[model samples]
Target: QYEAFKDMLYSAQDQAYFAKFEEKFFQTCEKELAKINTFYSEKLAEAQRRFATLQNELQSSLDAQERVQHRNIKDLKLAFSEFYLSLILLQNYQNLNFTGFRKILKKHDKILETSRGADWRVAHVEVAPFYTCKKINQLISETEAVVTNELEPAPAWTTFRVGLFCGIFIVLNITLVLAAVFKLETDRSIWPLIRIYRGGFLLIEFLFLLGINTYGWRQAGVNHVLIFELNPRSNLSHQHLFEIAGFLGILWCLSLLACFFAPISVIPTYVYPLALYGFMVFFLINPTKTFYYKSRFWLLKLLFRVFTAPFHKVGFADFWLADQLNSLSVILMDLEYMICFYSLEYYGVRAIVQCIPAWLRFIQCLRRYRDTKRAFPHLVNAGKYSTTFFMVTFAALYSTHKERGHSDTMVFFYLWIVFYIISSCYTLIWDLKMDWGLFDKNAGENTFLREEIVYPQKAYYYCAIIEDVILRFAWTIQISITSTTLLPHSGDIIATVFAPLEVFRRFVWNFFRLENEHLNNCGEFRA
Candidate 1:
């Protein structure tokens, strides 16, 4: 009994000591945080300064490209800035001194994430009402700015390649017309050859679009760049990431073609053995001599390790993982870009999409140089006529193969015809969206897929029956609904009430159509 009582006294003593030591440790941490905050703040200023310097260094390098050594300096400046910010905000939020009147000073070891706008937070009110984050917004914006400042035009020789591919159709149609005129025995299955030609053109385009520098259309937005992740974990958006996926997707597609049919897809022997191995090494391993001395320690750190690092490891790993992901993803993105030159060489929408980035760049350049109205219409008209030529060539062989017999393969061919029209018209839709009087930014890969499901719903419930009756009655009357819907001072109470519900419900149903979780993260790594 005496021994137990003595042990209890000792445990109480240790608890007192722990309390004293923990508080002292945090107090020491606060001063260090103050130092780190200053360091990051200065680094941000330095990045802005470097951005100005390089942006001015204009040595007549490629158009609007990040050139001049100032770019190198800016990259480092930003890296240093990333390093500084990453070092901070490491303390456990619960342990931090939240005393209301305490001065905001931090000499940090384990930094806490800023309570401001964190995804999840506890406590409605704090003992101390002060934020732990500043300049983070600046960090994000500058990162985005750097990406925009680095945009480049597509390479030369594109026009020639696009021209020749379209020309093939000209030669092709002349053969068909001449055959028809002479009354020679023209094959009813002539379109099979045309379909093959277009499929080949499409396959070539899918590969080519990757390498062409301007294919992303990121810079054409009012935001200076259209970003997939608007509030990304870092400044770098995953636009390049998405483009890389396209390239690999095309590689996977090519692996599909001439190799095996789907349902138990036999990936092209080249992809599994060659491309996969190459990319795995290139993206995952990233060996280079410069890395030996230049940024070896940072670059070599495992990506997954960045998330669960010791306090000492956090700053180092965050910037290291982020930096490599940033630069290497771009390199990986560009590695396949020369596919454009190759596809541009092989042949060619593909032609139109190929022309799009360059035309947009030219439009941007021309508008900047001269009167917008005069300069634009000339380009727009040129776009129109060339656009017309391609359309004619596309539809020239519009008629399909006649029914030889109703074999399954015959039905399969028709199914392919439908798919080819839809998939190939992606570029056509992009063109229409570009100049349409009204724009619906609900566009791109998912939009096509989404409408594939939604349009039918418009043909059910409250959405469906009205449409059939309206099309009959309203079609006769020629009544217009769209213009009035966007009328002046729209949305009284009922409109306001339903809008949010509709927005969220549609987004959710497209999911509760697919889970939003699988969109990116989940089943990726450890929970």
Candidate 2:
């Protein structure tokens, strides 16, 4: 029967024949099952032995079969997942009696449970943890596998552009030669202002961090300041704030002395920034951890818990250190952009690391893009073609203008902008056309076709427009900056610093209210 279905999938057939074939196939399959069921009571052990053997043979035969999905019977598990999801998408199709359709699939589950294909088919998705998430992870994994292992999309482009950025930054920093790297050589005038700006920002964050750990309404100052959702020994909180910031102050001052007093080899010109860099990095990195419980050596459960014991036993010192470090990490990124560019790859040997936002944004939208056409057929072109390209080019042109020669690319982006605006006018027309026919006398919109019913569709359309224009380009900015001299070229800084903090929290959330939130159920935190 599986062979017959596969054959039909390849064969020439009319709508009439295919519909008739579907009707006969399931009805016949159910009948054959009834025939087999009679043997379960009569043949007993014989049925069990033969069924398992025969089912294995058939499963091997159908091993690479293309998934089937139509009616309520979904193929194993993807297309089947599609059907179950479609039921949700159609709001359970109450108008079309989706409840009855689900009941039929439920009955089919009984036969599947007795079959070898059960693990791969309806019985699996039918059981537990149904989410759209599985398919996304599978998709992302496949993409990375192919790209990382197999493809060289542009080795030359990568070498040329990547080398150019690194080369320029290295020379600029090492020679301090470039005209742009210099703002003014007035360190005497400039040094004090750096102190005030850095000082003021740090002071605010410190007070905020300290205040949250031990805050309550009593400290609001005589009915003038309304406050609640704070606790602890407030006086002692400031006690530590003074203690730690003072030390960092001393270290920083000594760093300046080391800069002047040249004999002290430990404090290089790099030391002070490195100290801040190291501090901020401590709290910034977060990576997705692979579930490695399948590995045999170390007990997965035990390792994480043991590492987190520090968070469990948080005294004042632990809390103050974490809060300060986390505050500094966020500040470091802002500080980098606020002043000099710090390209990671400025070494003649140094290389810049950058992520492409064009593809990332496009990949993220693929689910929604596929969904738009699936659900809103009339809005097909809007989903398919109404997207961004020029903004990406435009943003890249600004960031890469100096490094990569940009006159031609800039013009190309300008052309795309003109074309995009023209295309947008046409998209507006389609949106109106879709809106009109979406529910009219001659309309074909059933609950199935239009799964989502909502107001503010115009707002949704404009929001999508913004996604193409503003959002996609925003990625270009982030990618360029992260890759440029303004920030760390890679995750080394963030991951190194934050890995311990993450373990600290994952094991237990304590020690100066790290993560700015989630520890206190009473008050809120803004990071």
Candidate 3:
């Protein structure tokens, strides 16, 4: 009867206890049915209102013989389709709750070794209000019929065509860049400019892989839209994401090409890359329908929330994006290079730029600590990012020392290496035990994994664990770069490669991290 006794199996001799349990189950089912019915009515009413509004708009445009009436029709149809989707989701809600009721009743029987639950379920659960509801099914059928009869969008082959052309355009521009930079007489300042070029593509590279990652999440039924609290109706598909990435890639290549050939008399060489970056900032905040404005606005809003983490309550998306920023520290550091290239050259702010993501995450943890009043995990988690401060500070100091011709054995260089290892190990353990929820004592047959895993292949988990460890410590490769080991600018080439590798590591990290998050949300039914 008490919360502590909820899961304990009672003696079969207590017939009144079983009766009370069945009554309680029925009452809860009835309560949930009422809730679902309320939600359905509210959503259906909104959909009807929108449908009527769109119908009026279409009729007015048609009466005026407007050429843009097709746009009106498109809007009306999209609205109808969205209405249809809502009905389907509602139906799923009905089905999921029904299934939950059945599962829990069966579990009750199995644990207590009784036949009464079966008969009770048949007498009550099958005849319950939620189980017997047919309105959701009817609404689903009506909406589907309306959508099928009124309009049909074309098959989605345009993604392939657009992707192909964009791919070709990228290769063409890359060849041009190579010929212009290598074949023609280029400036000595080209190396730094080129570093920015590679660094600038960091975001573009992230988008392209993100498209693939989105595809993977959907294929595996990760429910990322629900996890991220996105508007399901307007959420971008994987193909849409790819289209955005490919389009941006074309612009990035074109921008670099223009930098190579633009008239120096009119504009500076660095201006082209800067211009491309400027356009991206504008594109995200353009307040126009072009380029998925809603999603862009959502991202901007989420980013502002993340920037002010100490003042705001943290959400899943905020911390997730904060972790992503941690991986993008390299690109954030490049902001300093961009600033120095455009304005006064200085290293004073470079370390701060590199540490901004970690600092934000650290403050986020402290905020969590304050809110939850927990120190073991939250403060301990903050300690992980705290290690980054030492790692970064000593690294900056070591770089300055080396620039002044000091040996690698300098105290700053030694401290940097020690902190780097400590941070790397801390993060690697967090990735396993916390983020991915792996290495569990109760992993059962999965061995070093969790009790439940969405991914089918068990070997993939092992492979990911190994991959994560290797990439987490990949910074060690930088220590291998010596003045005597390679050709000029080759060090830059190798260093440039690390950013993309870190991006790729983040890509892999996302798949499991989200899967773990999805598994944790056992309350919802996601397909």
Best by lDDT: 3
TM per prediction: 0.23, 0.23, 0.67
Whole-model lDDT, model 3 = 0.72
lDDT per residue as tens, model 3, 1-527: 12222343343324436667656655655565567657666765665666566556655755666447777778778777777777677667667766765676676677667666577668765776555767657666666665666554313685675668577767967787687757768667776566645765888789888888888998898888988878865567778778777777777787877766656567777577778888878987888887787889889999999999999988878888998998887677667677786786323676677678889999988987898786866777899888877666666556566767766636765666677778889989988887788888987888788998887798888898899899888743342231112335666676577878888889988988889888874212233
lDDT per model vs. reference: 0.34, 0.35, 0.72
Q: Which candidate is the best by TM-score?
A: 3
| Candidate order by decreasing TM-score | 3, 2, 1
Q: Which digits, one per residue and each the tens of the lDDT, describe model 2 over residues 1-527?
A: 33443343344232325445545545654453444334322433333343344335434435533333222122223332333343343332222222332333343344333232343234332332222124323433443443344221324643454455445434433443233246344446434323322432343335334433333212322110112212322223333333333434444444433433354576565445555545533322222243222221122323332324232432223222332332233244345433443444132111111112222222323433353334443235424232334433433444455356656756754554565555445544433333222222432443212323232234533344334344323322332233342243343343333333323231222211121122222111122
Q: Is candidate 1 or candidate 2 better by lDDT?
A: 2
Error of model 1, residue 117, in angstroms = 17
Predict model 1's lDDT versus the native.
Answer: 0.34
| Candidate 3: clashing pairs of residues | none
Q: Which 10-residue span in candidate 1 carries the lowest summed lDDT?
A: 475-484
For candidate 3, the clash count comes to: 0
- Report, for all candidates in order, the number of backbone clashes: 20, 11, 0
